[PDB]
Structure formats: C-alpha cells, structure tokens
C-alpha cells in the first residue's frame, strides 16, 4: 500500500461481494447501478493499479472487472468493479456482430 512494487508472478486474492450499503456509504453518490464493491472495509486487501481490466470470479462466473477505487487497500475504501451481470446481452450482441 506504500510504494511501487510490480510482481512478475500472478497474484491472487479472495474477497467477498460487499452489500450496496457498504459500497454506497464508502463513495457517496459515486456508485451507479453498474458497479459493485468487493473487498474489505478494514483495508489491506484490494486490487490496485495494474490489475485494471482484470477478473473477479465468483462461483465460476465472471461477476466483476477491476475498474476503480480511491487509492489501494485504504480502509473504508474498497475497490469498485464493473457489474458484469448487467452486460451479458451487450457482450453477446457485440460478439455476434463482429
């Protein structure tokens, strides 16, 4: 959380899907219906710069895409991810037309 250390080896982290409450209360007026928070409010565990665009897989399903947050692993500042379950139709249509 303090510095710049980019690994050569793929890193892993298991985190839970946080409720809407914890997500919206962490970023007032900044969370839309296409975002979900996954992480720990106590900070210390989180995705960071470089992990962007990466996968958040839950129960064998891609539920999130590393998107944004305020810094990395700061307390009460969990990462926010694109809510993939709203984009299946878009993904399908796009793949079929290209």
């Amino acid at each position: 959380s303090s510095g710049s250390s980019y690994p050569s080896l793929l890193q892993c982290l298991k985190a839970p899907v946080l409720s809407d409450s914890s997500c919206k209360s962490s970023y007032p007026g900044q969370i839309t219906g296409n975002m979900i928070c996954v992480g720990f409010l106590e900070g210390g565990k989180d995705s960071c710069q470089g992990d962007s665009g990466g996968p958040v897989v839950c129960n064998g399903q891609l539920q999130g895409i590393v998107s944004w947050g305020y810094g990395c692993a700061q307390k009460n500042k969990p990462g926010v991810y694109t809510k993939v379950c709203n984009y299946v139709n878009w993904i399908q249509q796009t793949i079929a037309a290209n």
């Binding site: 793929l10 982290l13 409720s19 996954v38 989180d46 710069q49 990466g54 999130g64 692993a73």
Partner: protein, 125 residues
C-alpha cells in the same frame, strides 16, 4: 494486488495480460476469440498474452496474440467510470487447453457476501 498471495502456476487459465511493450492491464478470456477488460485500459495497439504466470520469462505455455478489434462500451463515462467494460477480438483464435481456458459469464448477479477470486499483476504495495 495488495495483501494477496501468489497464485499456483496456471491456476487462473482465463487470466490474460494486455501488453504494448509491457503489461499495462489485465483481461479475461470468455471466448476463444474474445477477451473482456476495462474501457479505461484502452490503447489502440494491444497484444494479448494468454497462459501467463511469470510475465518476465517465457515459460513455454504462452500464446501471444495481437488484438484485431477493440470495442469499448458506447456509454462508457470517463468521469464516473460507469460502463467500464471493453471487448477485444483476437486476430486468431486462442487454443484452449489446461493453461488457457474461458471463464463463464454470469447466469445471474451475485448475492452479497459471495466469496470471489481476484487476480492480476498490478501494484502489490
């Protein structure tokens, strides 16, 4: 990833590295020809690296394929980051095996408290 652990080699087969000289973002293989990532990771030139573990050393399981098409969500908002999703079509199909596999799209949204697995080569500090 901060406060994480080193994934077992190739235990995340759907994980890809977007490269343009060097790794800049992650991605997920959901189809033999398509990778999904974030729109804010957009670059006009992108090489997709599959079957990666140690992005600094050829291990012999990698498949380096250039992006043929890059499609960012039309409603992507750079200010709010709403619709931060992007699709990448590979110029040639990725060969699926034990080290390179697709990840399923959600059959439904996840309930709160659902444990998930996050991966990547981003900043660890």
């Amino acid at each position: 990833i901060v406060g994480g652990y080193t994934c077992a080699a190739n235990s995340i087969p759907y994980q890809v590295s977007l490269n343009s000289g060097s790794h800049f973002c992650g991605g997920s293989l959901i189809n033999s020809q398509w990778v999904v990532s974030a729109a804010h990771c957009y670059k006009s030139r992108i090489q997709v690296r599959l079957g990666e573990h140690n992005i600094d050393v050829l291990e012999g399981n990698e498949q380096f394929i250039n992006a043929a098409k890059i499609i960012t969500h039309p409603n992507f908002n750079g200010n709010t980051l709403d619709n931060d999703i992007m699709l990448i079509k590979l110029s040639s199909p990725a060969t699926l095996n034990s080290r390179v596999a697709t990840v399923s799209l959600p059959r439904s949204c996840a309930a709160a408290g659902t444990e998930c697995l996050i991966s990547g080569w981003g900043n660890t500090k």
